Swiss-Prot record:
The record marks Q10, N15, T19, Q45 as: Important for ice-binding. The keyword Methyltransferase does not apply. Detected in blood serum (at protein level). InterPro entries: AFP_Neu5c_C, AFP_Neu5c_C_sf, Antifreeze_III. CDD domains: Antifreeze_III. GO terms for cellular component: extracellular region. This is Type-3 ice-structuring protein HPLC 12. Keywords: Antifreeze protein, Secreted. SUPFAM superfamilies: AFP III-like domain. It comes from Zoarces americanus. Signal peptide: none annotated. Belongs to the type-III AFP family.
Length: 66
């Protein structure tokens, strides 16, 4: 209950460096990268196109580890 994940606020194209305008948060299931990790994600690249409204998962971000 109430646990938020990072959700794409825009289509995020492949190999694009994440910016704050790209990353909303929402309480969804399954649970993705926690919202609190957004600062860590800024400037990291996604390794695939991430459609609008997709929950961002650990395997979608180059080099990401919690």
């Amino acid at each position: 209950m109430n646990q938020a994940s990072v959700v794409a606020n825009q289509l995020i194209p492949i190999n694009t460096a994440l910016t704050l305008v790209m990353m909303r948060s929402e309480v969804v299931t399954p649970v993705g990268i926690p919202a609190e990790d957004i600062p860590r994600l800024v400037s990291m690249q996604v390794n695939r196109a991430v459609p609008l409204g997709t929950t961002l998962m650990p395997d979608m971000v180059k080099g990401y580890a919690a």
